Amino acid sequence: DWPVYHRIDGPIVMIGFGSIGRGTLPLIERHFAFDRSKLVVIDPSDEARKLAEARGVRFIQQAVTRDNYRELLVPLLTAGPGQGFCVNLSVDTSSLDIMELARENGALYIDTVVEPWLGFYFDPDLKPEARSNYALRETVLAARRNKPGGTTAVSCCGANPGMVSWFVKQALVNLAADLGVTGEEPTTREEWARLAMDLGVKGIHIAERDTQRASFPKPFDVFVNTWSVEGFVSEGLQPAELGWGTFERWMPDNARGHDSGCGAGIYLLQPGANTRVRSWTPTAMAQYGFLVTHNESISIADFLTVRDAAGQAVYRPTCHYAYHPCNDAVLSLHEMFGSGKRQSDWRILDETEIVDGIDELGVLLYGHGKNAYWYGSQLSIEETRRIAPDQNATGLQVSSAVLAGMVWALENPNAGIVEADDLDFRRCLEVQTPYLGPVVGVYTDWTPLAGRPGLFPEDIDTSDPWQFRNVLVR
Amino acid sequence: DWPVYHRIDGPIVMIGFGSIGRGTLPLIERHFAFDRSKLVVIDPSDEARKLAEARGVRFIQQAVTRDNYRELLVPLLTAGPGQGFCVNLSVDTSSLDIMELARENGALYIDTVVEPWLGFYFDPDLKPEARSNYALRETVLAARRNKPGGTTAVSCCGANPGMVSWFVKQALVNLAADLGVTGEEPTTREEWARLAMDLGVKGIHIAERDTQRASFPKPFDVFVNTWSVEGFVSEGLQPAELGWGTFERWMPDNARGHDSGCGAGIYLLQPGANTRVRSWTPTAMAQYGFLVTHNESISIADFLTVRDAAGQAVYRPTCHYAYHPCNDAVLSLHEMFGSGKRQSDWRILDETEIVDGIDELGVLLYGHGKNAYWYGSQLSIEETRRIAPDQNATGLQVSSAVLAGMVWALENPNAGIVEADDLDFRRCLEVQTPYLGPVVGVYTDWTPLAGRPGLFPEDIDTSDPWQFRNVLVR
Numbered sequence A, B: 001d002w003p004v005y006h007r008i009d010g011p012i013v014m015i016g017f018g019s020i021g022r023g024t025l026p027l028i029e030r031h032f033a034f035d036r037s038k039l040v041v042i043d044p045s046d047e048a049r050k051l052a053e054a055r056g057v058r059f060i061q062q063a064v065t066r067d068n069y070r071e072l073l074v075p076l077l078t079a080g081p082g083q084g085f086c087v088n089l090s091v092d093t094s095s096l097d098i099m100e101l102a103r104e105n106g107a108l109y110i111d112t113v114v115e116p117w118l119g120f121y122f123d124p125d126l127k128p129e130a131r132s133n134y135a136l137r138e139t140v141l142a143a144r145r146n147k148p149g150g151t152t153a154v155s156c157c158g159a160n161p162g163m164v165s166w167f168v169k170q171a172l173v174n175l176a177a178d179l180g181v182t183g184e185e186p187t188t189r190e191e192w193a194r195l196a197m198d199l200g201v202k203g204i205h206i207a208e209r210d211t212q213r214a215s216f217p218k219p220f221d222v223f224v225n226t227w228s229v230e231g232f233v234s235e236g237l238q239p240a241e242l243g244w245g246t247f248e249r250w251m252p253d254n255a256r257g258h259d260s261g262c263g264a265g266i267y268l269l270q271p272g273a274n275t276r277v278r279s280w281t282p283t284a285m286a287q288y289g290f291l292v293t294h295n296e297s298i299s300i301a302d303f304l305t306v307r308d309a310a311g312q313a314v315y316r317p318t319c320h321y322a323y324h325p326c327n328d329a330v331l332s333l334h335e336m337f338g339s340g341k342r343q344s345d346w347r348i349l350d351e352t353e354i355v356d357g358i359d360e361l362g363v364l365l366y367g368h369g370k371n372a373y374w375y376g377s378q379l380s381i382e383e384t385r386r387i388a389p390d391q392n393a394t395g396l397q398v399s400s401a402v403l404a405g406m407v408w409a410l411e412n413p414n415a416g417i418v419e420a421d422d423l424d425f426r427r428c429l430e431v432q433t434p435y436l437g438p439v440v441g442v443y444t445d446w447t448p449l450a451g452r453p454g455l456f457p458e459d460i461d462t463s464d465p466w467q468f469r470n471v472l473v474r
Ligand SMILES: NC(=O)c1ccc[n+]([C@@H]2O[C@H](COP(=O)([O-])OP(=O)(O)OC[C@H]3O[C@@H](n4cnc5c(N)ncnc54)[C@H](O)[C@@H]3O)[C@@H](O)[C@H]2O)c1
Pocket: A015, A016, A017, A018, A019, A020, A021, A042, A043, A044, A045, A048, A062, A063, A064, A065, A089, A090, A091, A092, A093, A112, A113, A115, A156, A157, A158, A159, A160, A161, A162, A227, A228, A229, A230, A231, A232, A348, A398
């Protein structure tokens, strides 16, 4: 049977019942022991309400807002008799404020994004830097500095950000084994960072190819995606963003850094979902990805930073997303950016609408002695349907990661504010792996120089194939 | 019943029986009187042969090459006893060499592209300027100057290039009429150029949106299009090219001019099918087009050039393609450029495989008093099926233009080498319009600066919305 990892003895307050809430609820019911009615779902959507009613869960049809979130959430989180768990899977809500509220009230917390209150992402008076995931993440790091320890709150623990942090650790272990690098497995951040350095890992792509195909053709003036349309558009219109490696010797003219914070990132003055990068996955082989900003682009580069005694970085990997979403989402971005405005309507593909495909999601570690190594999940829609309900393959990678984070938090409930990079990666992957389909490590001799230069002159650097100069599509 | 325009008393030699040849054959049979034994098709393809056999037409299964074209075509084109007609709808053959051969032997000639012999388009030894459509066109103009007059030979008379030159003339007349300007239409090149100047037309997009959708989802590693995949990929890997307007105040760093020739164009040192421009059509409204090189980008700009007494251009419109192909072609380009190689296989969508959609193809005249005006054809797949066999909507705009050019040629026997800009636009549109669906003119207040600047700073020129600086996606 399915493993039951823990008992939960307090309220489980799920904020949001979109594609990820819908996929996560069945895993929570499956893998935890608790009186069923301790679970309650909060979502303003009529669609969400109807689905929640069919699943027989307490449902509160309300938008969580800056004005109401304390009045709304505290009674739910503190109902007792035991410790509650806030499972935040929403858009338009402040991750930071809800996290701090849960912690004030002794409730566990998990989310999959550092989301702001409604009005941030398209605020015209905000500087591009302030709209960056680096900036959003720095608010979480500052919160941790302000109130160290206390109740566990897990930030950005979905598939990516989230699971991919655990993949990076496993990939580093595998590379070390394959390259004959000796020593016991790292047990501290500094040891992980030095292992990456010693292996010669210049950078990392979060290298993803979603091949899920719908049973209907893309409709005109409809944004189609396999997960949040609102969320993908939000991150897609944020600046392109990357963890910035010490080996990089070029940045584009419209790249900018940060005056404060962990120091691990740069951003570009252009939207990430209209920024292309050359990348690679096992099934796609060479492909374009979009350089969409992601928390882990910064958190992984930060985590793997080696500093000298003076606090200066001597090593840091480049790290960023290289996302090839489903074909209908590729068309949706072409339509949105070509129109200069969001489509009138949108839809998220249901498993019943998907005719085949996989969400191939892994980490591509490059620059080392075997050139490039991709490690990750090749989960298909067919396998997804066999092992978890109410979601597609994109959804299941995310929901299972939330499941893993919940198990970790319940096992470690007084660890304070943590990121996916802070968790025990083996324990998390132990929990998650039943839901990931084939999990494989693949070497390739592909580099961003492949086939180049072609018929035209290009701004390339063939002395160093993996330079961002070569990866960025200009 | 359908009109029969003319008798053809000599051989009709069709070179090529791909998507355009298959669509053009029935129109030639429909609209001209000739003994069936006079028409013969030449194509090396087995698939083409089987279709030709099913249609009861003479078929010679042979590739036309530099080595064999004289030995093959001179007898066929002079079989007699009257004047023959070479209808060249092929790839990998020299338009110039074949048109000169037809002329030398008194046969009429028409084609839809200035195509070179096999070995030219992907030659990395040739400099990008020499691979340009500007340069190919100059060879045709030179041939005309060296042997003026003689047998009529029509260059680049498909939908675009071709028909869209007629649309520009009709659009100019319409713009004037809509302003309350009465009187004689232009009758010389110089007068057409002056009309464009006088109306304040700053530039022209060949503004196309193909919404034909397939009955099957796009296959991986298959290039899908609604017309020649080989031809589209070839032009798409040529440099981006555009007729260059006198109003333009900026060009990109990798733009280059031509040291000789008509002077009307520039090219970019990058492939046109991976170059995006902001544009507009009635059904698409604001969209991205690809800046794919096209003969008419140069020929229309050249045609509409006004020079001073010193022979210096004082007015010329910008003119270029702004192509949004069918959704599966958009995905095919994303795939080809992202992988850095041509797909393993390709297919052209048959009308039986198209569930709906239109080929909306027109000219967008901008910069005048009513800002922008789109004039052109909205041909649906539904309309296409009602009125012509063996083709989709893309095919029928092209095949009907070839029909119109043929009627024109038979009515204008000794015209020498002519461009679509040289043809009598009202006569050609009279013949073509039954096959075009609605031919409509639509004003819009949209400009490339709609919604800009937005969330990020941009190098835009707010003093002049239609500047290429604002159009080009950078
Ligand atoms: N880390 C990852 O791997 C990952 C992956 C997918 C999604 N995400 C994030 O997870 C979140 C959920 O994604 P999804 O695919 O379920 O999105 P979705 O768009 O399907 O659902 C979002 C839900 O939030 C609800 N909502 C909107 N405003 C709200 C408010 N004020 N209070 C409460 N609920 C509100 C909506 O009604 C909707 O049901 C998004 O923020 C998304 O960016 C992270």
